[PDB]
Amino acid sequence: YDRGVNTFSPEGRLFQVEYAIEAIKLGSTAIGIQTSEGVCLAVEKRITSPLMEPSSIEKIVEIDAHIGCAMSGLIADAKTLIDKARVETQNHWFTYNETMTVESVTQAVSNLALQFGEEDSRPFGVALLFGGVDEKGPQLFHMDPSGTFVQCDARAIGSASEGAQSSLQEVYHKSMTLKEAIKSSLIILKQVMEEKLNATNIELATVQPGQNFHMFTKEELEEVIKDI
Amino acid sequence: LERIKDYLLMEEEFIRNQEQKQEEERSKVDDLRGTPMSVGTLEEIIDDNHAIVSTSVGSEHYVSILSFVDKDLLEPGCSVLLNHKVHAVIGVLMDDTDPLVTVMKVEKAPQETYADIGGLDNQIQEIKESVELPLTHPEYYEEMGIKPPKGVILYGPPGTGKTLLAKAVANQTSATFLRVVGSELIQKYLGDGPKLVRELFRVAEEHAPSIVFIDEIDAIGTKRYDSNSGGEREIQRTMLELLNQLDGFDSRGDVKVIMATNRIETLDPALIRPGRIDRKIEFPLPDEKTKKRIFQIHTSRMTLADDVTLDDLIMAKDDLSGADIKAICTEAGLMALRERRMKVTNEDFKKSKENVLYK
Amino acid sequence: AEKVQREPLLTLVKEIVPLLMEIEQVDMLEKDIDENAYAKVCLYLTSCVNYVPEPENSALLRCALGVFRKFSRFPEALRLALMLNDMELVEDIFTSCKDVVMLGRHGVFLELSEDVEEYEDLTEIMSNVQLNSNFLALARELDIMEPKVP
Amino acid sequence: SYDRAITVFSPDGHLFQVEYAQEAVKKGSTAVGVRGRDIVVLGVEKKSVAKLQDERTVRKICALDDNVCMAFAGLTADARIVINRARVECQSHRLTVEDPVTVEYITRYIASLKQRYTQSNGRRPFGISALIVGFDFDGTPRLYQTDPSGTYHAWKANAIGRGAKSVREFLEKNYTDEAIETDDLTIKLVIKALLEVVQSGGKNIELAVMRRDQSLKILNPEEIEKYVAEIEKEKEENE
Amino acid sequence: QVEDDIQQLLKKINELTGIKESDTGLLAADKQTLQSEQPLQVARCTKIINADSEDPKYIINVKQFAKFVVDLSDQVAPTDIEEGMRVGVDRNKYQIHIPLPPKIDPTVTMMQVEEKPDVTYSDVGGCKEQIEKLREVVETPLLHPERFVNLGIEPPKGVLLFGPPGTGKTLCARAVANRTDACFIRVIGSELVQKYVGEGARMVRELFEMARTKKACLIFFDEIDAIGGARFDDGAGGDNEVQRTMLELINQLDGFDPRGNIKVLMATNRPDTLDPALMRPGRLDRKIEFSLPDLEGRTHIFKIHARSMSVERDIRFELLARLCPNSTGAEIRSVCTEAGMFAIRARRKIATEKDFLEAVNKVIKSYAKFSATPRYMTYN
Ligand SMILES: Nc1ncnc2c1ncn2[C@@H]1O[C@H](COP(=O)(O)OP(=O)(O)OP(O)(O)=S)[C@@H](O)[C@H]1O
Numbered sequence A: 001y002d003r004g005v006n007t008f009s010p011e012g013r014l015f016q017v018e019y020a021i022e023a024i025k026l027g028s029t030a031i032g033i034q035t036s037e038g039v040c041l042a043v044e045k046r047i048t049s050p051l052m053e054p055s056s057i058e059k060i061v062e063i064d065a066h067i068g069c070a071m072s073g074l075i076a077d078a079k080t081l082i083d084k085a086r087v088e089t090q091n092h093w094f095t096y097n098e099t100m101t102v103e104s105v106t107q108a109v110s111n112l113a114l115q116f117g118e119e120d121s122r123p124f125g126v127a128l129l130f131g132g133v134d135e136k137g138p139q140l141f142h143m144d145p146s147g148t149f150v151q152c153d154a155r156a157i158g159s160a161s162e163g164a165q166s167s168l169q170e171v172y173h174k175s176m177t178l179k180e181a182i183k184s185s186l187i188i189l190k191q192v193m194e195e196k197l198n199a200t201n202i203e204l205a206t207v208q209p210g211q212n213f214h215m216f217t218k219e220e221l222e223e224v225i226k227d228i
Numbered sequence B: 001l002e003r004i005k006d007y008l009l010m011e012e013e014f015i016r017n018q019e020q021k022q023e024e025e026r027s028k029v030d031d032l033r034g035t036p037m038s039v040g041t042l043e044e045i046i047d048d049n050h051a052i053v054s055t056s057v058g059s060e061h062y063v064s065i066l067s068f069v070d071k072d073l074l075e076p077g078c079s080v081l082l083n084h085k086v087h088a089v090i091g092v093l094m095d096d097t098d099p100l101v102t103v104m105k106v107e108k109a110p111q112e113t114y115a116d117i118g119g120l121d122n123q124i125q126e127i128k129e130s131v132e133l134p135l136t137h138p139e140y141y142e143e144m145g146i147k148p149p150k151g152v153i154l155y156g157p158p159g160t161g162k163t164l165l166a167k168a169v170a171n172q173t174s175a176t177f178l179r180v181v182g183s184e185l186i187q188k189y190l191g192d193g194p195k196l197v198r199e200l201f202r203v204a205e206e207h208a209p210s211i212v213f214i215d216e217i218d219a220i221g222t223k224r225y226d227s228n229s230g231g232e233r234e235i236q237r238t239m240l241e242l243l244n245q246l247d248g249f250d251s252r253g254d255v256k257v258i259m260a261t262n263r264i265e266t267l268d269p270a271l272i273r274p275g276r277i278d279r280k281i282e283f284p285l286p287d288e289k290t291k292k293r294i295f296q297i298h299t300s301r302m303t304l305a306d307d308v309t310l311d312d313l314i315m316a317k318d319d320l321s322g323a324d325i326k327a328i329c330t331e332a333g334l335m336a337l338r339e340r341r342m343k344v345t346n347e348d349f350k351k352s353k354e355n356v357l358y359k
Numbered sequence C: 001a002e003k004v005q006r007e008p009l010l011t012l013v014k015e016i017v018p019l020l021m022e023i024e025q026v027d028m029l030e031k032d033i034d035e036n037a038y039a040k041v042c043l044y045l046t047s048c049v050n051y052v053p054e055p056e057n058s059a060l061l062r063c064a065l066g067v068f069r070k071f072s073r074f075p076e077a078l079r080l081a082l083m084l085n086d087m088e089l090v091e092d093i094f095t096s097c098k099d100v101v102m103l104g105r106h107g108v109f110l111e112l113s114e115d116v117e118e119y120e121d122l123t124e125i126m127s128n129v130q131l132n133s134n135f136l137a138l139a140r141e142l143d144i145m146e147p148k149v150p
Numbered sequence D: 001s002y003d004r005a006i007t008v009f010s011p012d013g014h015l016f017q018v019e020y021a022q023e024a025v026k027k028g029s030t031a032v033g034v035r036g037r038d039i040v041v042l043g044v045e046k047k048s049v050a051k052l053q054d055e056r057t058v059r060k061i062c063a064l065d066d067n068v069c070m071a072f073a074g075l076t077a078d079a080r081i082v083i084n085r086a087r088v089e090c091q092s093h094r095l096t097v098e099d100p101v102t103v104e105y106i107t108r109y110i111a112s113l114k115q116r117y118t119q120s121n122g123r124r125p126f127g128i129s130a131l132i133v134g135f136d137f138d139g140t141p142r143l144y145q146t147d148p149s150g151t152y153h154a155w156k157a158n159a160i161g162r163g164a165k166s167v168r169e170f171l172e173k174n175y176t177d178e179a180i181e182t183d184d185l186t187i188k189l190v191i192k193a194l195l196e197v198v199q200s201g202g203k204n205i206e207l208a209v210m211r212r213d214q215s216l217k218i219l220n221p222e223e224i225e226k227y228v229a230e231i232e233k234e235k236e237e238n239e
Numbered sequence E: 001q002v003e004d005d006i007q008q009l010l011k012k013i014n015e016l017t018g019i020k021e022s023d024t025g026l027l028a029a030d031k032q033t034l035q036s037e038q039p040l041q042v043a044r045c046t047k048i049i050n051a052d053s054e055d056p057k058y059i060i061n062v063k064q065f066a067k068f069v070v071d072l073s074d075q076v077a078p079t080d081i082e083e084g085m086r087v088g089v090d091r092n093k094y095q096i097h098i099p100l101p102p103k104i105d106p107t108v109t110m111m112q113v114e115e116k117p118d119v120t121y122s123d124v125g126g127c128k129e130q131i132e133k134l135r136e137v138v139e140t141p142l143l144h145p146e147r148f149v150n151l152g153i154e155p156p157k158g159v160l161l162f163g164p165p166g167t168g169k170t171l172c173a174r175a176v177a178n179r180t181d182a183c184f185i186r187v188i189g190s191e192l193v194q195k196y197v198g199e200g201a202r203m204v205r206e207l208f209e210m211a212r213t214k215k216a217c218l219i220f221f222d223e224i225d226a227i228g229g230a231r232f233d234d235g236a237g238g239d240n241e242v243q244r245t246m247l248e249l250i251n252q253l254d255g256f257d258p259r260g261n262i263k264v265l266m267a268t269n270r271p272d273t274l275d276p277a278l279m280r281p282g283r284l285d286r287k288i289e290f291s292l293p294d295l296e297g298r299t300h301i302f303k304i305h306a307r308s309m310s311v312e313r314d315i316r317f318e319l320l321a322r323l324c325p326n327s328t329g330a331e332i333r334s335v336c337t338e339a340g341m342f343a344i345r346a347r348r349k350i351a352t353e354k355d356f357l358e359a360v361n362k363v364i365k366s367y368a369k370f371s372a373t374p375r376y377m378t379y380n
């Protein structure tokens, strides 16, 4: 029984945005942790086949030289927003000679998180984790399809976010360090993933005021995993 | 050497099974009973060894009972034995026999076995492991305590062999087979759907371990009939009764259910949930290899003139089914006995191809 | 030769009716424990109380006391104490079931299993010896009943 | 124009038409493709031709550049549209930057077009799935596939079309590094994979290769016959 | 052999030994008592219209014969011979002997449950609040009329249930019907659809007859959409008999001398085409609903279907629950059983994790084209 797609609920919410919040849940997990040393971040790739070449799946993409990101669930709706967010950060540094802070980036994205309509189509289906180091120190940011953007100190998303948030609130406090948070994230990863944790499953992305750019090539991941 | 003593004592037990005054007691039971034993109808039962009955005209009586037969074989809506002179309950009458049963129960060994099915080999093991291996071999499931899969939907385009698969399961069987085509659930009287459904599954649950095969059930929604009351608002209630009868209350039992459709997308998905039906099986148009088995088996019992090639017929239609193969393999024989022959030439197959396909 | 063939059950029940069955058991019992014990002692205990008269059942119980005296899982010998009602058996199964240290639970079905005589003979010879005094605790009274009611 | 949203989310979190337009891919012809290290190879099976007609128009493998190659599944008309737009885009890239067009760019273009096509107002999603094989600068063979969702996704061998699970199961027990040692063996490996797929009479086996410093060569179906013959000879040598 | 031949000899020895009593002793288990029941009476039953004044002088319609004015016999009570009362009347002298229960329409007699299907509360774990509320309504006043009296309230005499299909409605009903202690009465919603006009009304009449006779009972309604949901009025005169049945269900439920010690449970799959006269509380008070088990519910239902089956306990269950975001307990049951069926492909006695992964991608991702709940979550 097909109603108009821009119909609220008998209870109050909407429909299609709520169905988007449901559509997040099938996606792969991701974990980002704010630390005053810098923002660390982790994700799972969910490798399916051995024919599937592993280094091509993107989860952490690059918005600015100091603003990172991670995506979830649908890949390509996220790709549009990543491209556009990059464009708008370039417009800000151009017309202002300065760095668009991460909150202003995410305001610019959730301005049209919901412009879905028939004139002037569907709501987007991706949850995003935004990091980076602005002038306000490190920042970790989380949005949703509904544009309800909030700051989170260490948010975990997607399919395993219940036990991830719970066991994350077990281990987290305010004065953590970097590497402790990195292994604290990947312990949660290899409790919530399904396959054996190895060199090809996960990927990290850490950005620091000292380690100036988010840089994470392979096989330091090997050194981090053999430290478990 | 246990055969001698075991046979002697077992025959003694069998003759003491027939060894169960006494003739005077039989004559006294016959004295209590009248000779014109009249037939009545129960309505209610009162626990003080006398109850209410109902005669054939409508008159009703509080009558006692000649209690040697099991009165607890009787329910409301039962047939009793009554007297003329005192109307008392003479005793139990065995049940009337049995137009719904004799119509809806296939009694006979009903056609050929798995030697006739044309190259499926994977669907077959699924219906095998869902009906045959559970019922005939109920020993694996005890080991794991896993209940067998309940319902099986056969579906696919027409001509693929749903009917054959049902007949082949009905061949190699040990259970009572119950066949109702689904189009018989549309009646020109109001409120006749649930009566058919409750009688069908009453027969199934009362008789035996059974297989209720319900064929072409998708035609119950996409076929409105003028010979009907208010259509969709009775058909929906019929489907709802079938639903509740299939997965409702009170310990369902040893009843297997197999259904077969052409289209599946016009079904109310409330039947198609698990708990009711666990296996959904696709029947595609097979290949160009098992067609050789189909033409081979449907030409396995004929004087085939060897101047023909079956690969000439495989290439012919790109989406032929076993229906087309049977149609050609019989129409060629009809062309053969049109001219008093035994063996079948190539032009017989050509005329049969031009008769079956393009008309 | 049927120890070579190794399918018991029928050779056993044939060789009952020829003690002969005594040297048959201690001659046969070296390796296989649960086939002779479970199979032979099940079918021949049940068929011995069922069909067979009483005096060969004593040979069942005494030579089964021999091979089960060789063997572990002592409630086979305690059911031999059920059919025998012997007083040496409870001393042997208490030096042996103290040798195998559940414990109060075999106190429980010990006291349930035993009749009127052997807990008083048991509490007098174990009133002499007792070896830890915990069999004077368990195997007279009060310790079949102390775990249950709470 | 047509102010409507065709593709709505599900109540349980799906796009009906993206997940469901994969079925149209699932009911098309099969096509495999592997990369060797120096010679790339791909080809389609199940032409399911009438064996007695023209065949130069039903070609399911085309090219966009002298560097890049095509394959697809699903229905052919949407492939025709996407290929026309891809040719225009790669040549317009050659208009600007003076390189030969990288394969990753054209796959991102195809997937981006497909996603903004599914997103838009009342446009039915493309029920195809392409294979884009090319070897860009410094000779690196790479191969990507598409999806009606619009996820470019790099593989090492292919599994699309009818019965792709069986074909990937054969490639699973056939992932030998030895197979990509001899170019001829890689060709024979495609032939053996497609032989573990459909009739493979040597009629609907249309295959084309590129040795990464040349253009695509469509093979004349007598060489493929000798390839199948030596495959059958090695299969007899297995016993 | 020895057990077989010796059991044959012993059992047939007892049989051929009692054969001496069989051939030596020469139904009558009641024969003298039945011939003392020959001075009893045929006792035809009737129906009473009214009484008369200063005297009994009773008036009776028999059933078909005629209507007679009668008198009572001496072994009766002059009080309980009120009007509309099926009494047994002498055939010869036409006199009233015993009043009896009324006509019950025996096709309505066969929907009292008469048994108890074995379904325990443990089988619906992961739905704790729903179990709590439905417990609070159904179980507590029949077992403890203590808090409900000493505080001075009335418990909600009606509870409706709904949700997506296969969510546990039927199963919760059966769980109550195990521990009911009352006269639990099943009603399928299609039982009220008969060939003739206003006949289902009489069925509802007889339902509440049985309900008012036996105190402290339960009536379960099931799939009430057939009973009637909407009163769409046009120039056609379509669904109307169903509508009158629904109205007669309304009035004899609650209004003008309410129901007594009866509780009604309804259960539908689509609670959206319902006339709001049913949605008025006082008839259907608590709207208890079954949503999908969110995350821990499916872990618990895996514990339910997995506790008595041959698995390898070294595996986890949380990873299994994480792949089933919108799924019912029925699909969980299919996953467990199908993982067993994949274990039957080989010859094993314990499951593997891979068996359950085969089961997940066999049930959910394959038959998710049907899946039964993308168009019932919207409650179409
Ligand atoms: N796979 C097959 N192998 C051999 N014969 C077949 C096969 N499929 C169908 N047939 C032939 O088709 C007949 C059976 O008809 P079905 O294919 O079962 O018809 P049907 O299409 O299932 O009818 P429905 O169920 O109403 S669609 C047999 O007599 C066979 O000759």
Ligand SMILES: Nc1ncnc2c1ncn2[C@@H]1O[C@H](COP(=O)(O)OP(=O)(O)OP(O)(O)=S)[C@@H](O)[C@H]1O
Residues within 6 Å of the ligand: B247, B270, B275, E123, E124, E125, E126, E127, E164, E165, E166, E167, E168, E169, E170, E171, E172, E268, E269, E293, E301, E304, E328, E329, E330, E333
């Ligand atoms: N929450 C649950 N926990 C455990 N088992 C469940 C649960 N929900 C369903 N099941 C199982 O799946 C079966 C189907 O549930 P039912 O309540 O019988 O479905 P239903 O109530 O008939 O739904 P319909 O089709 O709308 S009447 C139950 O009988 C249980 O065996």
